[PDB]
Design a protein around this ligand. Structure first.
Ligand SMILES: [K+]
Ligand SMILES: [K+]
Ligand SMILES: [K+]
Ligand SMILES: [K+]
Ligand SMILES: [K+]
Ligand SMILES: [Mg+2]
Ligand SMILES: [Mg+2]
Ligand SMILES: [Mg+2]
Ligand SMILES: [Mg+2]
Ligand SMILES: [Mg+2]
Ligand SMILES: [Mg+2]
Ligand SMILES: [Mg+2]
Ligand SMILES: [Mg+2]
Ligand SMILES: [Mg+2]
Ligand SMILES: [Mg+2]
Ligand SMILES: [Mg+2]
Ligand SMILES: [Mg+2]
Ligand SMILES: [Mg+2]
Ligand SMILES: [Mg+2]
Ligand SMILES: [Mg+2]
Ligand SMILES: [Mg+2]
Ligand SMILES: [Mg+2]
Ligand SMILES: [Mg+2]
Ligand SMILES: [Mg+2]
Ligand SMILES: [Mg+2]
Ligand SMILES: [Mg+2]
Ligand SMILES: [Mg+2]
Ligand SMILES: [Mg+2]
Ligand SMILES: [Mg+2]
Ligand SMILES: [Mg+2]
Ligand SMILES: [Mg+2]
Ligand SMILES: [Mg+2]
Ligand SMILES: [Mg+2]
Ligand SMILES: [Mg+2]
Ligand code: NA
Ligand code: NA
Ligand code: NA
Ligand code: NA
Ligand SMILES: [Zn+2]
Lengths: 122, 52, 116, 52, 89, 77, 53
RNA sequence: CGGGGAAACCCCGGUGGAGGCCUGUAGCGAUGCUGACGUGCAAAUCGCUCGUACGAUUUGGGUAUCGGAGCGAAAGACUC
RNA sequence: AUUUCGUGCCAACGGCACUCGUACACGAGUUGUUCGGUCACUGAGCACAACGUUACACCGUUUUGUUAGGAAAGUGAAGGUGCUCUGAAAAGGGGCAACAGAGAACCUGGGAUGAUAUUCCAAAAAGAAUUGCAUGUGGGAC
RNA sequence: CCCAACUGCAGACCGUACUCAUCACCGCAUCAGGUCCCCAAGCAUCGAAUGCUCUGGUACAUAGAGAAAGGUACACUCAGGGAAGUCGGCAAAAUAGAUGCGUAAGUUCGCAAGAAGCAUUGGCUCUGAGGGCAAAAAUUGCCAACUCAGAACUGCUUACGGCGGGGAAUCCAACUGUAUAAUU
RNA sequence: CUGUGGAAAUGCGAAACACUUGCCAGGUGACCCAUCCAUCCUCCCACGGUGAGCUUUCUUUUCACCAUAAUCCACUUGGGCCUCUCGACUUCUCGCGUUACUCGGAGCGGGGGCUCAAGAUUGAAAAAUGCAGCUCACCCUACGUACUGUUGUGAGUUCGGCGCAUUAAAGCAAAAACCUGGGGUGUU
């Protein structure tokens, strides 16, 4: 509230950066991949979906050299020097599953630090 | 503001006392009004000193 | 905003039944009684009634159990008078007595002169 | 319930080792610290008590 | 006389009680709330504390005086009469 | 509760009769010994794990020793 | 009409036990009820079976 | 704090927060509809509207004064 | 003043209804060194004693420091004896009246109940404390 | 015999369930009447006004079907006229917040006064003013809160709740207050 | 040595700094509005980690939770006071300070200190507790065992500052109990 805001700048915001850098979030999808629910087409879609939907500085589809969405052995890994909230990647995963059908089969939990794990319903 | 300037010795006690009573008398509208008056006071004091 | 109840068996808001609100380790808001305070020792009322230095303000139970030093001072009239009033009494005692002695000598000398 | 003020005067007990406190109606001009003398040999001054 | 032409301190009473009764109480009210001269310490610091009791803010002395003024006119003549009568003896 | 300031007075307290038990608490990066006497609980803190196991092992077997853990509801019945 | 001290003494004489606490209340019907806690050296269940329960 | 004046003294702008002061909740009352009900919800109640609301203000417990007597800012009011 | 809780139950009662109930029946429940009162304060006040009055106490006085023409103190400073005599000083009889005034040493957690809890918890007391008396030992002084 | 720091043992009596009210108290009763104290959320707004809502609590008041007249209402609307109604403008209608400008006779000079009266008010995108803390200081950097004043564009069916009608005179009592519980 | 340190404000506590209901004197108990600043606590924001809600399209999103009792040990703000400045308005009009009605040779201000009140920080208590999650993990019927998580310059708010303290022809109860001293006894 030091400077008055304007409607023209509603879609833009500064992101704020880390000091030491090199923070990585992981998502594990081994269980659905082992079964037939997560075919490699879905895995490719999953990695692709994260690519054009992660929002940097207020805009999506324009993340380079600061956010890496590399995917290796069924574990999506996001490496960044930007400052993010861990719940954001849980919020993105739920949207992707809801766009597909599996929201009623697969649940997402926090297995450990900086990791999320996908498993089955009962 | 007046207390800070006196501590920094940018004004003396005689100037401080006169401006203290004028602020209580509703002469300065805001902070910028007070600084401009102080700058004017500092200027004509310097000119008189150099003339003497 | 949770609401509280009186926990003792007096339910009136007097100067002695004053309560504070406390949050417990179990995440509950309860009422706890804060006791009264004392005004502390003072100088005599007819001498100004001022708060004495070097003495604490203690209620009945705490004043009885406290060490003597917390309510007194090493000088004469320790926890009764301030140092100005003590100095006034000393000066008054000496000067008045000297004046009394002066008069007695003056009167006796006058009697001697009359005798001669 | 009273218009006139009252005065608290402190005396020494004539026969015992104790102090006596009295309460009288104050004449105009009485002040705290004043000395009051009562008796046949008291002088004529404001605040003294004398036989008629 | 910027805020009020003539009412003065009696301006808290609005338009009640009549003009003359308000005037008669204005003289005594002004003196009762004023600061009077202390002959003990030389300051203008005497104030009233209940009717007839006057206390000095400087030397903390309490005197018995008049209801609305520190010294009544009758008191001064009595003081001089007594002093003259005492020295007469 | 009272705090023990040095090893010397800790040994005096432990040797003292009416010492009901000694409870040993293994916090991270610190270790506490709590001696339950009458009317008061005395505590001694040690910063290093070494020179603390030695103190624990050098306790008279007459004194009852307890290792503090977290007990479940069923364990507390 | 009995108080706690006499209740404690009477229990010791009748049943040869040591108590650590005695609590009492007066019932709404007028009778007085007492809760008596025994020492850890004595078994409440054993005493109850001796009396016949 | 500024102006005006030879003086006596006068004037503007602020600050301050007085009053059995005003509008208005709770509270304490009871003006009109001569409204509702009038074998009632009620042996005096209900609805809108209305008086006052820092004071001669409202209220709990305790205590004191009575039958030709008590009490009454006075209506012969009130005293289960 | 048992309406609280559990179980059963529908004759009468809850101006209609009931399988429901503050109904009916049978059994249960209220735990304190520290909470409130009291031990233990005074207030507006009351009225035992004493005195006076009345044909007759079932009447009057009884806090403006204070009963009674009125001998209402049964306490014991310094000192002597031994390991218990003599006596200084103290005027004004005995009570009651505040569960919002004065006063008052305890706090959280609980898997501890069908119903009570700052009142219950027992050796790792879930525990941590504060205060009233008596003692015995270790130490300073007689 | 006195004491400090410990330690050992013992800590008396009565109250304790439930209620405190549109069903537990007083009004013959589970009666729209009466009855002291404490705790008190979010948004609109000057707000303990009034309207809606999370927590906690309720769906308990005899119901179903269903456009007769006449009624009661803490319910409304009416062309043209506008008190002609009536003892009497009774009842209803009507004014209304905030901001800018302006305001009579009389007067005890305090008031009268919100006297009277005229104008503006939405939405959206912008602009200016009003401050703290750091530093070797008419400088630089970082940061909070919500008021006030303006401009362009665009719109109206005058559109929640809440909220004074005003003026000219006569009689009486100076004023605030009290006062016939149940016709003044 | 016979309590003791400091020029002073006044400090020092294992048990002689012992006793003082012979006596006397003070104090606590003990009483006062409003404005202003404002405690405990409440509500809002910021920071983000656990779980849920919505998701044709939007929303780095919406909701819940994020705790520390008594007791004990060891830098700020406000008031009072001491000392130095060989002590300020010497001199046409001195200085400090409040939102606010005033204060100063009967001792302002400035440097350094003593003390009281209210807080802050550090530690014992106290994580061993509480609250959530997981509970197709690893078990079998046990209230079972592992494991994971645990900033405000905002807006209100009478504890306190606060009384010789309100309008006043109104001036704000008393006592028990307790505290300290003057005298006196006591130690060498
Ligand atoms: K006002
Ligand atoms: K009105
Ligand atoms: K609800
Ligand atoms: K008019
Ligand atoms: K009025
Ligand atoms: Mg005080
Ligand atoms: Mg005398
Ligand atoms: Mg009991
Ligand atoms: Mg009014
Ligand atoms: Mg009618
Ligand atoms: Mg009203
Ligand atoms: Mg008549
Ligand atoms: Mg029926
Ligand atoms: Mg029954
Ligand atoms: Mg009395
Ligand atoms: Mg009380
Ligand atoms: Mg108690
Ligand atoms: Mg219950
Ligand atoms: Mg109960
Ligand atoms: Mg009712
Ligand atoms: Mg708003
Ligand atoms: Mg309301
Ligand atoms: Mg509201
Ligand atoms: Mg009905
Ligand atoms: Mg028409
Ligand atoms: Mg028309
Ligand atoms: Mg007509
Ligand atoms: Mg006609
Ligand atoms: Mg009308
Ligand atoms: Mg005019
Ligand atoms: Mg207008
Ligand atoms: Mg009238
Ligand atoms: Mg009237
Ligand atoms: Mg009537
Ligand atoms: Na008024
Ligand atoms: Na009593
Ligand atoms: Na209630
Ligand atoms: Na009902
Ligand atoms: Zn004076």
């Amino acid at each position: 509230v030091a400077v008055r805001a304007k409607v023209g700048s509603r879609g833009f915001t500064r992101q704020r950066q880390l000091a030491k850098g090199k923070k990585v979030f992981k998502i594990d999808c081994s269980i659905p991949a082992s079964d037939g629910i997560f075919s490699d087409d879905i895995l490719s879609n999953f990695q692709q979906y994260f690519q054009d939907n992660v929002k940097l500085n207020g805009r999506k589809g324009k993340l380079t050299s600061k956010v890496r969405v590399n995917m290796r052995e069924n574990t999506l890994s996001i490496t960044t020097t930007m400052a993010y909230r861990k719940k954001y990647f849980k919020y993105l995963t739920k949207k992707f599953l809801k766009k597909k059908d599996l929201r009623d089969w697969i649940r997402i939990l926090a297995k450990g630090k900086d990791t999320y794990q996908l498993k089955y319903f009962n | 503001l007046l207390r800070k300037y006196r501590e920094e010795k940018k004004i003396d006690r005689h100037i401080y006392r006169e401006l203290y009573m004028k602020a209580k008398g509703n002469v300065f509208r805001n902070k910028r009004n007070l600084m401009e008056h102080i700058h004017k006071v500092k200027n004509e004091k310097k000119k008189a000193r150099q003339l003497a | 905003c949770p609401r509280v109840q009186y926990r003792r068996r007096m339910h009136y808001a007097t100067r002695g039944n004053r309560m504070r609100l406390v949050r417990t380790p179990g995440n509950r808001l309860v009422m706890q009684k804060r006791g009264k305070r004392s005004q502390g020792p003072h100088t005599p009322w007819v001498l100004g009634h001022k708060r004495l230095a070097g003495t604490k303000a203690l209620r009945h139970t705490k004043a009885r159990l406290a060490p003597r030093h917390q309510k007194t001072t090493s000088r004469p009239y320790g926890g009764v008078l301030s140092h100005e009033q003590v100095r006034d009494r000393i000066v008054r005692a000496f000067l008045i007595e000297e004046q009394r002695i002066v008069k007695r000598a003056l009167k006796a000398h006058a009697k001697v002169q009359k005798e001669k | 319930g009273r218009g006139a003020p009252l005065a608290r005067v402190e005396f020494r007990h004539p026969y015992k080792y104790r102090r006596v406190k009295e309460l009288m109606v104050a004449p105009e001009g009485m002040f705290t610290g004043q000395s009051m003398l009562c008796g046949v040999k008291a002088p004529l001054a404001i605040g003294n008590v004398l036989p008629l | 006389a910027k805020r009020t032409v003539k009412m003065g301190v009696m301006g808290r009473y609005g338009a009640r009680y009549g003009s003359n009764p308000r005037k008669r109480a204005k003289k005594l009210e002004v003196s009762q709330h004023a600061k009077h001269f202390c002959s003990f310490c030389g300051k203008f610091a005497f104030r009233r504390k209940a009717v007839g009791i006057w206390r000095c803010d400087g030397c903390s002395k309490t005197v018995a005086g008049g209801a609305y003024t520190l010294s009544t006119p009758n008191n001064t003549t009595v003081r001089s009469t007594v002093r003259r009568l005492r020295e007469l003896k | 509760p009272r705090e023990i300031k040095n090893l010397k007075e800790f040994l005096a307290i432990c040797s003292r009769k009416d010492a009901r038990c000694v409870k040993v608490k293994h916090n991270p990066k610190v270790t506490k010994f709590k001696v339950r006497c009458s009317r008061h609980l005395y505590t001694l803190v040690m910063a290093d794990k070494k020179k603390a196991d030695k103190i624990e092992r050098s306790i008279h077997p007459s004194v009852k020793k307890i290792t503090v853990t977290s007990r479940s509801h069923a364990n507390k019945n | 009409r009995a108080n706690k001290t006499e209740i404690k003494k009477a229990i010791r004489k009748l049943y040869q036990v040591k108590t650590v606490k005695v609590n009492t209340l007066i019932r709404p019907d007028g009778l007085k009820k007492a809760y008596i806690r025994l020492s850890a050296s004595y078994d409440a269940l054993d005493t109850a079976n001796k009396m016949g329960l």
